[PDB]
Design a protein around this ligand. Structure first.
Ligand SMILES: [K+]
Ligand SMILES: [K+]
Ligand SMILES: [K+]
Ligand SMILES: [K+]
Ligand SMILES: [K+]
Ligand SMILES: [K+]
Ligand SMILES: [Mg+2]
Ligand SMILES: [Mg+2]
Ligand SMILES: [Mg+2]
Ligand SMILES: [Mg+2]
Ligand SMILES: [Mg+2]
Ligand SMILES: [Mg+2]
Ligand SMILES: [Zn+2]
Ligand SMILES: [Zn+2]
Ligand SMILES: [Zn+2]
Ligand SMILES: [Zn+2]
Ligand SMILES: [Zn+2]
Ligand SMILES: [Zn+2]
Lengths: 329, 322, 329, 322, 329, 322
């Protein structure tokens, strides 16, 4: 077998040209999806202290910023509405309002940038008073199938708005198949479904809850009855297997860097289009450190390259614009 | 053929007791290795700007703190000496000095806490004036085999100091074999070698450089590369490593998983200074809860590590003790 | 490859700290399920000569003992009723009596210890005059589908009583799917089904039959037309595959130590939550030897560690309390 | 259990943006190696009838063109000397001449473009009067081990000329090991060996023979054979190859795929002169669009090559630069 | 392991007899399928400049040429009609005309050469004014399921004409299963379906479009919304898996030589009858080079041997007659 | 998820043309090796009672028949000498006699038919007075390493006679390595070694013993054993075998399949004398049709053999020539 000194693995590392020739993975703009927090109103722009460099944008402002995103070649945006407090309810009806932020935003971006992919978020958590991803029963448990009925209405409203991709982020069992059935019935033949398949009950989501405004709603609440236990890996494969059987066109792991092993297993086992979410707390961690001068800016591309190496096709990342700028070089 | 609604994966999630029964991985104190930066003087600690909460410790201070580490059940420490500048050189001779910080610290700990594992760092980077992990040729290239010769002498001095484990962190080709041969030939039959097998040229290392007081793409691995890590580990195991390590850690969990799956050998991971600093800074800014520490360490276990070198070891152990 | 003396596998064994660092498996209280034999009546406690240290307990006494079990962190109990002789019948109707021991016990423990998992036993063998796990036809054969109908009524009665888990221990073909269908229809969405998937026709069950009082009923009778032939391993994988397809949330091998290879194959092949039953005769064997001074008490944890190493997530064991005490340490 | 119509594989195909997101492989300039035929004189180029658009270049001409190659980001060139007839012989001595074309070209390039990789060809076929890749016995059989001895001397001369990679294309058994040993023994520690591991006796080579100015079934592999290619690569890797190559290319993509999957090692492929000529002739006749060039090179990536030796390298790189 | 010089892999190569003994693959006439372009009319023969040596043939002329093809042992022909311009339409109705070229041709060859396999082409592209493989909606998108309805009518018309094999080359999702269902319903129990499973959106098809006369129709148009992205390999396995589930008797990769890795993966993964199409541009490339004297004629058999080695059972190739002649030797 | 009636496996069976297209394996003349029993005299043949239709042939008779074998395309013969009794001994010296039958036959064939492969039998069993495959100790045990020494000398004499392949049939441990080393050391670089790797102690051998004019459970394998065959082949390949063989054949097709799948190496199978006699006797009694011959040989191909040693080779080749 390979043995020193006949094999010296430093030889390929000796020069840039050979490191290039043997380099196993490369990040390109084709791998990047930009999540964006969308405000109601006009000429609104809000900094998020726990996500330095990220702004919530009203739709007019989103349209302006999207010019450069498109110019940079970023394939898709993932939209997250910042729902006004008074539009939150127990029944999460705003989720399917044709005049909801997500729906208005989608329509606006679809008209303005016909080639830009818009991935909407299918979940009730921006819409509930309690901040849970589904509807609660009288014991305070997030009901599975009752929640799916609302998610289905939501997803159809997104498809009606022109979204090319809906991304159910809710972790109810069976929701992919229910959404697929409804889209197919309704003639939304080519609306993709990007399932959040292995989405963990994680501490890395804090900043997002602040960004979208669910943090105050959820309070100290937890999602361990639906989001996955961080300890578990084999279980992720069963989650993905179900979602592919149910018709997902893409499957996602969330969070990201703390779960690269799950990305790798999922790509290896299913050989399907595999996505990963570099979550708010990941972005915040890195930004915090960069701004303190503790880590060089080169960590950005290293973090994103890791997702490629681990087997992701596409990466939802708040660093998408900076990454794409650096890639353009 | 598991399918909704016959299969509802939420059933097991419904209650704590069923989550606990099916829980696939559990971090324990047996998984933790505490890295520590060791100063030369007496009655001294220094704070590290880029590593909030971590202190460089003189040996007397190290012995005081190790009393609590041992009481918490932490199995081992990884020592990193902070070499005084005056002792740095081109030839890295201080690395094998019998009275160098690492050697002194090792002797003092082995005597006070005989059951505590001591993992020394076998590398020239704390000892070179230029801070590269090996000896430079006249073009500034880190010479492989000449570097090994120094590493070997270093490793022997650690064994003589009583280290139970030496950990070559240098990424020279072939060093694990060289060091093993030397140890065996010297009668240090039971000194373990914890190879840093897949160590990447990473931006996540900056804070550790500030900590120890110390451009490596010709020896450390390209972050893009995964298959190559398997070839690295294979060689190290062939060469006699008792344990193999991936570094950095979280940014490389896929590597951990592949390594464990491929070789079924004792597998370690280093949650490096950058990973610590990013997490602790976010926790301190109030952007992330403290629970992220155990989540990050659980990830290593899930990914297949047996042990984790982490600056959170004490905090984690305390939380486990609850 | 790895060769002596470059590789000396004693090096990691040289010290406790390194044995700890490399130790591949660890038993925790999270792995333990306590089976308990439950009597009718009040203030009843009965020693079982063939299970030294084990008592059958009336429900009041069970409630008292369960205080310490909970205090010790044991996640779940598995209940086995000791059915009064006169309540045994050909039709096993007591199996679904809402006032049966198992049902009363379940209700009592669910109220008193809301977080404690209760796993009920779905089988007709405590209820038949003949001691077989199903209903007999006129040739004395245990009818498959007729027995399932009774098992379904039983399982529903358990769910109605509040059990979080029902565990069909009967080995009829297809019963998992029938029970799942009935639970789903009835709205018992989150009642787990712990299938006894690979349950062998074993000699190690003797003491249990004495403990629950089926021994006198079964007499010299055998279960080779439904329980699996000890010789067979590949067949266990087909049993588990069916039960997972039919909706089991967990799958079990029984007995345990004499079948660790089956545990290993089952975990490796399916990557599903895998349980194992350290049966009465296993417990008795070990206790007998410990009390004779032939084996040290350390054999307890070694036996349980073996299940972890072989791939079990959870272990039904009469040693659960002692184990948990030792773990608490 | 993916099934229509829940699964419709056209959904991802519906839009450019989703095609791009799920696109499994992407050719980049980092994948390209440009082979070049090098003439002996000064201020000279020659057109090659069977390779439209490819020119033989004198070294001064090579240096001019390499300026654009380097600007386009092409990582490396593969040099093939066009040996003047007068310098051919039975003993192939010209192969290790310090002033042979390959050596001269290597020195000139290493000096002008220090970052550009130079891959020399280690083989006797440009040097033998008979054009076989090795030294003939009196029955016309290409002697294995006697040939190796010449190849070794050749390889050393290339290392001395500063080649970063030597590529034995000769298909003698055992040569990779012999050459590695020689390089190591001479102190050329970092010279890579790119073994032509699975090189077939193929009809696709004709045009290259016209290009260089140079019946091989006793050494080159039978096109029918696939398992045998794995045994070839295994030996080469054991023997110290840093990279392994399949040749020809497109007609052997299944070989590329198996090799990559089996060994997870740096894998290269040669789109040979015939493959080039067939494509360029069809493109010129107007029978195939220019887009076939990138399609053919994308295939190599999909099949698992890390790098591709291709006469289209410049054209491809230019198109990538868009 | 195997090491030089104990192992010298040249030894088996030393002599023809040992190369023969160890030769891993051999091409035979049993592997060859001859595609043929079929004209309307009588006594028509047309050379195709971009496919030197290939002629379009009216059916009388096809019948004459088929004598030698049969004499040579070629198992099957694949028919491609050259539809008259004026019979092209938006609705592609000519596709199912019982008096269409393909149908007439099939009937003629089935009567004359009862043992010769006839594989008809199921696709709408020879029949549409726009040259796309399906029916367009008002956005110019090739509608999936509406196109299948036409393909089904087409395939049934072929079966009625006596074709033993229909080969859907259209790349609509789900068409294999729809065609299979229709054939089964109609009593065409033994009509094979040779699915073009992994058919890529390739530049190598140019000459065929000229040969059949779709080139002028398609113009600069592309098929990237249905034909596969050349970059993608894992996706081919999902395409084949679906087609086998849907009832394909054979599966095909197209193009061929530029996709041999896909052939290999497909054979290895499914162990099913696997076919590959050496497309017009492949044939043209090689012929061009042979006629220029750049490549020896021996490249023909080398190219075809490659398909065998890569795992194909059968090869659609314009070189079939020459190959078969050489094989006859 | 293939299921009736969407999947009907009879569709492909419906017509000859589709059966031919999907047909997974095809016997060709390239797969056939003809074993032949060679007598010492001149102008002589002998019929073998237990092998109807097979004749022992003097060398002049062998040369006459080989003309048709060569015309039929049979690639190689396997020679088995029928040693005159007077030349048998305890020390098996006749095995390496330069004028022994095998050597004479080899020279005569190599000269007349230079393209025909000649596979000689390396074993002592035609040469020992007791008919065991090796040299006996005083307890009647077949000595392993002492036997090898004779086999080696035998093998060298065959190489000197011009055999292209030597086939050790002896089942001594380690002989393949010993023989390879000897051949290489003597300069017989290209002599192939076709190891009888998995050769079973079988009842199917009786007729061959009558044919050659020659209780083996201490060297030949137990018919019960399959995993053990993999270990046998692994060693032989490590030791330098160019080809590996299973013997007997049909009764061991599962072994062929495992061997091919595990090692992907050139794999051979011997349809032994018993297998021939059972088939030919049934064919002659009219109990089985002649078509069983091609069916039996097709089985070997399906099972994964590259080549088949069969007494039906001529008949098969003739049928193939149709
Ligand atoms: K590359
Ligand atoms: K557990
Ligand atoms: K551990
Ligand atoms: K991508
Ligand atoms: K053969
Ligand atoms: K075939
Ligand atoms: Mg799910
Ligand atoms: Mg290394
Ligand atoms: Mg069952
Ligand atoms: Mg070779
Ligand atoms: Mg398809
Ligand atoms: Mg042997
Ligand atoms: Zn949500
Ligand atoms: Zn260092
Ligand atoms: Zn029972
Ligand atoms: Zn050559
Ligand atoms: Zn078409
Ligand atoms: Zn013998």
């Amino acid at each position: 077998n390979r043995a020193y000194p006949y094999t010296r693995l430093r030889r390929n590392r000796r020069d840039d040209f050979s490191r290039r020739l043997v380099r196993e993975n490369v990040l390109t703009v084709d791998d990047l999806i930009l999540p964006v927090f969308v405000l109601d109103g006009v000429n609104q722009r809000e900094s998020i202290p726990s996500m330095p460099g990220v702004e919530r944008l009203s739709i007019d402002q989103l349209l302006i910023e999207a010019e450069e995103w498109v110019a940079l070649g970023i394939p898709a945006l993932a939209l997250f509405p910042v729902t006004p407090v008074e539009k939150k309810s127990l029944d999460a009806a705003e989720a399917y309002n044709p005049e909801g932020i997500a729906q208005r935003a989608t329509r606006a971006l679809r008209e303005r940038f016909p080639e830009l992919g818009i991935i909407t978020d299918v979940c009730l958590c921006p819409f509930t008073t309690h901040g849970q991803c589904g509807i609660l029963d009288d014991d305070g448990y997030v009901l599975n199938d009752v929640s799916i009925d609302v998610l289905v209405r939501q997803a159809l409203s997104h498809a009606e708005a022109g979204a090319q991709v809906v991304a159910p982020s809710d972790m109810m069992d069976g929701r992919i198949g229910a959404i697929r059935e409804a889209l197919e019935s309704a003639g939304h033949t080519n609306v993709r479904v990007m399932a959040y398949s292995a989405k963990y009950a994680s501490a890395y989501y804090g900043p997002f809850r602040d960004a979208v405004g669910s943090a105050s709603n959820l309070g100290k609440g937890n999602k361990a009855t639906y989001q996955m236990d961080p300890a578990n890996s084999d279980e992720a494969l069963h989650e993905v297997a179900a979602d592919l059987a149910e018709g997902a066109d893409m499957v996602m792991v969330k969070p990201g860097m703390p779960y690269l092993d799950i990305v790798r297993r999922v790509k290896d086992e299913f050989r399907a289009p595999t996505f990963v979410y570099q979550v708010s707390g990941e972005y915040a961690m890195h930004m915090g450190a960069i701004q303190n001068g503790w880590l060089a800016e080169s960590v950005i591309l290293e973090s994103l390259t890791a997702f490629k190496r681990a087997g992701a096709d596409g990466i939802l990342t708040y660093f998408a614009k900076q990454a794409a700028e650096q890639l353009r070089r």
